[PDB]
Write a protein that binds this ligand. Structure first.
Ligand code: R6H
Ligand code: CL
Ligand code: CL
Ligand code: CL
Length: 271
């Protein structure tokens, strides 16, 4: 059928030959895996700076399928997946690799924190904070419009491009909507909740959500109607937008499209 035809098309495009790739220095390293800088040789003989994340048969095919879908996304506020390679361990375990364009500014969360230090990015003005929120909304609007559920939206999963555009990516209790803590259920309105938390991380220039509240106490804290507090110097109108993301009933939360225009309107009004 066409459903399967489109899957086979996407799969054909996503794989990159291992020898078109050279891996350089480690950028990050954990239990999950590692991220390294690299170069990728393209069709025209020229090379591109990339980041490469490195993570039985079923798992690999799941990974390829998922990758194939990500690569087909095309939006300036969603990270572009250039492709994937599968390397094999000397103990016969596959080592899957995801290849993305290298973004020197790194993840939004760290950049917010560096901005509060003298050597870092300079102080980020309000207009630029809102622009980051608008960028994220635009990426999420695109993804929700094709019913992709993110499941882990947070500032640590947003990346900054060379031209300061933010894009949605994906490398957790305090980002999880109240209904998904309770009923282990997840919709786009659960993503809206996480977006609200992400807005608050941006407006606080990288604070951890819910100071004074431990993860084990989070469901109960929210059950009693408590929410993230309004940041110091956060405009009342901006706070209302984020607060709307945490309404107990998912159907009462605005969509990403509604949010995006609310944020654009606020941004245009700023003197
Ligand atoms: C919205 C869904 O997006 C995804 C789905 N998946 C996914 C999930 C499951 C699966 F089976 C398959 C895929 C493809 N991965 C992503 C994704 O965005 N991955 C990703 C994101 C960021 C990564 O890191 C970097 C990229 C670019 N420049 C960096 C620069 C750095 O320092 C200066 C840097 O320091 C650490 C890290 C950088 C990265 F290596 C990988
Ligand atoms: Cl190499
Ligand atoms: Cl902090
Ligand atoms: Cl709080």
């Amino acid at each position: 059928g066409s459903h399967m035809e489109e899957l086979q098309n996407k799969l054909e495009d996503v794989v990159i030959d291992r020898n078109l790739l050279i891996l350089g220095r480690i950028l990050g390293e954990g239990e999950f895996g590692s991220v390294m800088e690299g170069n990728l040789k393209q069709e025209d003989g020229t090379s591109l700076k990339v980041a490469v994340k490195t993570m039985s048969q079923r798992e690999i095919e799941e990974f390829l399928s998922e990758a194939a879908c990500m690569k087909d996304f095309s939006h300036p506020n969603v990270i572009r997946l250039l492709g994937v390679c599968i390397e094999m361990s000397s103990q016969g375990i596959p080592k899957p690799m995801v290849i993305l364009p290298f973004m020197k500014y790194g993840d939004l969360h760290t950049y917010l924190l560096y901005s509060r230090l003298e050597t870092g990015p300079r102080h980020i003005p309000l207009q630029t904070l809102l622009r980051f929120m608008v960028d994220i909304a635009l990426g999420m609007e695109y993804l929700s419009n094709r019913n992709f559920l993110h499941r882990d939206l947070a500032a640590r999963n947003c990346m900054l491009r060379d031209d300061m555009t933010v894009c949605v990516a994906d490398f957790p209790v305090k980002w999880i909507a109240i209904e998904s803590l309770a009923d282990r259920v997840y919709t786009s309105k659960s993503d809206v909740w996480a977006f609200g938390v992400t807005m608050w991380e941006i407006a606080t220039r990288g604070m951890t959500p819910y100071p004074g509240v431990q993860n084990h106490e989070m469901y109960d804290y929210l059950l009693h109607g408590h929410r993230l507090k309004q940041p110091e110097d956060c405009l009342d109108e901006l706070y209302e937008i984020m607060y709307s993301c945490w309404r107990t009933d998912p159907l009462d939360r605005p969509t990403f499209s509604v949010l995006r225009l609310q944020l654009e309107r606020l941004l245009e009004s700023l003197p």
